[PDB]
Amino acid sequence: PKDTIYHAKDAVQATKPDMRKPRLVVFVVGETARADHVSFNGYERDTFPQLAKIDGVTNFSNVTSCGTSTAYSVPCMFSYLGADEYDVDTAKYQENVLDTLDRLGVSILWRDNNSDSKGVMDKLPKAQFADYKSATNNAICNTNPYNECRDVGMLVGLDDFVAANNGKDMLIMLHQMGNHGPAYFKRYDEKFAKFTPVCEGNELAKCEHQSLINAYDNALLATDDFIAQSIQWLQTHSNAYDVSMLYVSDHGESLGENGVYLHGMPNAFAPKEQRSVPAFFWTDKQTGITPMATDTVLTHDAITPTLLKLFDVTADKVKDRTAFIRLEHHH
Numbered sequence: 001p002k003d004t005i006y007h008a009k010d011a012v013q014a015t016k017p018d019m020r021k022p023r024l025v026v027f028v029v030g031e032t033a034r035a036d037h038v039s040f041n042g043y044e045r046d047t048f049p050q051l052a053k054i055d056g057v058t059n060f061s062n063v064t065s066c067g068t069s070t071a072y073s074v075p076c077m078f079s080y081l082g083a084d085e086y087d088v089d090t091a092k093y094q095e096n097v098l099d100t101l102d103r104l105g106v107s108i109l110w111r112d113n114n115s116d117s118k119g120v121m122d123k124l125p126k127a128q129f130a131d132y133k134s135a136t137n138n139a140i141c142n143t144n145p146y147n148e149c150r151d152v153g154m155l156v157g158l159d160d161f162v163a164a165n166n167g168k169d170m171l172i173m174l175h176q177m178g179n180h181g182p183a184y185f186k187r188y189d190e191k192f193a194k195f196t197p198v199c200e201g202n203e204l205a206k207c208e209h210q211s212l213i214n215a216y217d218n219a220l221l222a223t224d225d226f227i228a229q230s231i232q233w234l235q236t237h238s239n240a241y242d243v244s245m246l247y248v249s250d251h252g253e254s255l256g257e258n259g260v261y262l263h264g265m266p267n268a269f270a271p272k273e274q275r276s277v278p279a280f281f282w283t284d285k286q287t288g289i290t291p292m293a294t295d296t297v298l299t300h301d302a303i304t305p306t307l308l309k310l311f312d313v314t315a316d317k318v319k320d321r322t323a324f325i326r327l328e329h330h331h
């Protein structure tokens, strides 16, 4: 073990959950989703029909991920250094935004249907991380012939967590399997097989291009569903809690441009398709939270100040950072 480098020991929470409505936020950490395959960003196909029916969803059309892989992007999304000073080999030892929120009294939960938190949860008690790739945590793993656990299974029993933390601020990270490839056709149940035909081979260049895109977009439909149902779960708590939902993908995906597939390329020569990511923010009416303009130039650096603002926490390190949400309030 090494000593922790601190970045926000000055951080303070301006209001406590016993003097105002406690706050409950779900942060969906996306996976392999491309911004240009989002309907709201101009994509021909309606890949997010369920989010289109929900009032108060803001789509952000200019979000660039810090990196092109899970191991690189996820720690930086929760970091105080920002991507320009970020070092993947020492991120584990920096105080991160979840450290700050937990220290100030916010109850943190991380459910993972992807891999793990890439070190972000390492300083917090183990019980606050849960592996939802296990079929004895996730009840939604036998709905497909692959025995693949589904992201929506992370919504089961969250009410037990809320009841165990009654009256406290809560931040729940849900780490998606999402659009992980190359086997996009495995990422969704049959109810989302909307675009056909579908590539079902493991070698992407060998399938016809339209079938690969169809499987990718079908996987997006399952993500649209997962985000929509996350909002619907939050809405059941809106009387007692100020509820909000943030979605950001960790990186994009190449889909055959210049013969390139998948992601994970070094930033120095990675194509833009691996960095252009969707971002969504939803909040209930009573929260008093105001989103930034949909065309704000944004990066993963916006995530940490957003989470801090959602819980009324000020940190000097990120005082000049742009977030997904505004600081003015209209009564």
Ligand SMILES: [Zn+2]
Residues within 6 Å of the ligand: 031, 032, 069, 070, 250, 251
């Ligand atoms: Zn990833």
